[PDB]
Design a protein around this ligand. Structure first.
Ligand SMILES: *C(=O)C[C@@H](NC(=O)OCC(C)C)c1ccccc1
Ligand SMILES: [Cl-]
Ligand SMILES: [Cl-]
Ligand SMILES: [Cl-]
Length: 178
């Protein structure tokens, strides 16, 4: 079964998605979005909590599916701490890049998922003996979803923020395979 970080993230995303149905998207964004006013710059959960919001069924379904599989594998073979750090860093950097180019109204686990995909892929590529790797079939489906995002075949975050997410995963896999 999915480990505690994999699980709690899934739940938290579900709980937040429910809140968005009941209260509407904007009202939840009011509490969880990246600081959108200087008077909010010190509400520190906001530098992370944007990752918890999703805006359509597809968004959350595909995000949580990749999270469950990639995040769950990383947690199981490499431990909870590893997943936590990949998540915190990719969420911060992809959120940063996203707000820089398009403002603070966005959300979702996509940055985090790009990181995990980059992490699992490069890790297996550079260091089979780790046990971690991204199957050929999954590389293909990952590539297809990356293309969908690149050429807009409607998503919260832009290409840049997804790249920022990927860079974190590649960076960490690179570090680890030394
Ligand atoms: C974030 O990138 C939103 C995408 N997520 C997607 O499925 O990417 C998966 C790749 C493995 C990175 C999305 C998907 C469906 C609907 C909306 C947004
Ligand atoms: Cl499970
Ligand atoms: Cl997105
Ligand atoms: Cl390791």
């Amino acid at each position: 079964r999915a480990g505690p970080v994999t699980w709690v993230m899934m739940i938290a995303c579900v709980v937040v998605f429910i809140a968005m149905q009941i209260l509407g998207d904007q009202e939840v964004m009011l509490w969880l979005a990246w600081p959108f006013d200087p008077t909010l710059k010190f509400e520190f959960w906001r530098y992370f909590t944007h990752a918890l919001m999703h805006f359509s069924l597809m968004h959350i379904l595909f995000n949580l599916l990749w999270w469950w599989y990639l995040g769950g594998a990383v947690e199981k073979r490499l431990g909870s701490g590893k997943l936590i750090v990949i998540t915190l860093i990719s969420a911060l950097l992809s959120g940063y890049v996203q707000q820089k180019f398009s403002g603070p109204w966005f959300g979702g686990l996509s940055g985090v998922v790009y990181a995990l995909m980059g992490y699992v892929w490069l890790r297996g590529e550079r260091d089979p003996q780790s046990g971690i790797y991204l199957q050929r079939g999954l590389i293909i489906f990952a590539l297809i979803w990356i293309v969908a995002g690149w050429f807009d075949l409607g998503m919260s975050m832009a290409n840049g923020a997804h790249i920022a997410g990927l860079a974190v995963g590649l960076a960490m896999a690179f570090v680890d395979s030394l």
